[PDB]
């Protein structure tokens, strides 16, 4: 169906312990495919998925240079933001950026992204128009002015509409056997008495890709949102994901509860019950 390429940039200052570390990781959907770490012994853009390995040395060299330049730019930027907030040189700070493109099933651009955060709080974001910015505060307004003066939104728009989607489509083709394969969840319901009055029904989804999934409990055909415990979807380490949903039910009322599962890899949504 729909696809994204996203890069996730994290830069972290560490006063008294050298210069800020910069790491960039790149994803197509839920699959990481590259990394760059300024703390590595020899920082290089490195493959993290098998399908990207076929790219020639030109790809790795070009991206490595971009990341090496970005390392210095983020260090310069961390200095600037420290000043924008009148902060001491003693404290550690974090600058994060996420950028990239989304395309539809036809591979056409749905939208682009370029968002930044400072110390875990929204700082500045490129609007969906790819032509204007939203600055969170007067510090970020300084950045906005610099970027407006220097045509940065135009650069982002050109990148997102061009390079980003072109590379995403290329990656999707090279890794089609995995990137364009949805693996359905393997599902089951477990049961454990809590007391004489209650028991937990836990609905499991294992081995699915991508991570997007809907796992719900209904009682008597009505969603049990407030009473359901949903764990965060978690990576298995084999590309796939895991999740469970649990509800506490009165003893003997188990068959009034149904677990519902929606996922892209399923030919049809599932309805499960505890099978004693």
């Amino acid at each position: 169906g729909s696809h994204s390429m996203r890069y996730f940039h994290t830069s972290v200052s560490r006063p008294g312990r050298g210069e800020p570390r910069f790491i960039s990781v790149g994803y197509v959907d839920g699959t990481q495919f590259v990394r760059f770490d300024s703390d590595a012994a020899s920082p290089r853009t490195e493959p993290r998925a098998p399908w990207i390995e076929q790219e020639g040395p030109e790809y790795w060299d070009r991206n490595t240079q971009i990341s090496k330049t970005n390392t210095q730019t983020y260090r310069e930027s961390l200095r600037n933001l420290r000043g924008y907030y009148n902060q001491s040189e003693a404290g550690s700070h974090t600058l994060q950026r996420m950028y990239g493109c989304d395309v539809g099933p036809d591979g056409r651009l749905l939208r682009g992204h370029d968002q930044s955060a400072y110390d875990g709080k929204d700082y500045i974001a490129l609007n969906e128009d790819l032509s204007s910015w939203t600055a969170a505060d007067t510090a970020a307004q300084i950045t906005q002015r610099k970027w407006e003066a220097a045509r940065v939104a135009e650069q982002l728009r050109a990148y997102l509409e061009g390079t980003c989607v072109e590379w995403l489509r290329r990656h999707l083709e090279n890794g089609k056997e995995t990137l364009q394969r949805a693996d359905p969840p393997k599902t089951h319901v477990t049961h454990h008495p809590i007391s004489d009055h209650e028991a937990t029904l836990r609905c499991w989804a294992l081995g699915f890709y991508p991570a997007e999934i809907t796992l719900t409990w209904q009682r008597d055909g009505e969603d049990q949102t407030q009473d359901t415990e949903l764990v965060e979807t978690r990576p298995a380490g084999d590309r796939t994901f895991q999740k469970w949903a649990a509800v506490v039910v009165p003893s003997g009322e188990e068959q009034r509860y149904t677990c519902h599962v929606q996922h892209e890899g399923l030919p049809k949504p599932l309805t499960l019950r505890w099978e004693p």
């Binding site: 994290t10 990481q32 404290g91 974090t94 764990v231 978690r234 298995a236 380490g237």
Partner: protein
């Protein structure tokens, strides 16, 4: 600085079968800032050369990492994850429970 304390999940890659080699996962997420110490424990002792994923973050800017290592579960062996973060006064231990 508003900081965020890590969520922690400890679990296996594959369904647990006693005496069958598997992978023990500790997924830490929802935390900020990004520095964090994560240990995998076998009967209270630190497992050596545990691997981890490359630092990334979620839409809400919070960080996540997966720490993982080979293990062969048994009935007797206890596994756990020990996490330290600036938001924690002491390390938090989460035991592996093959039903979670």
């Amino acid at each position: 600085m508003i900081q965020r304390t890590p969520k922690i999940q400890v679990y296996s890659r594959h369904p647990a079968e006693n005496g069958k080699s598997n992978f023990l996962n500790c997924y830490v997420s929802g935390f900020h800032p990004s520095d964090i110490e994560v240990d995998l424990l076998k009967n209270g002792e630190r497992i050596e050369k545990v691997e981890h994923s490359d630092l990334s973050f979620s839409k809400d800017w919070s960080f996540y990492l997966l720490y993982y290592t080979e293990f062969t579960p048994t009935e007797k062996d206890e596994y756990a994850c020990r996490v330290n973060h600036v938001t924690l006064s002491q390390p938090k231990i989460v035991k592996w429970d093959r039903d979670m």
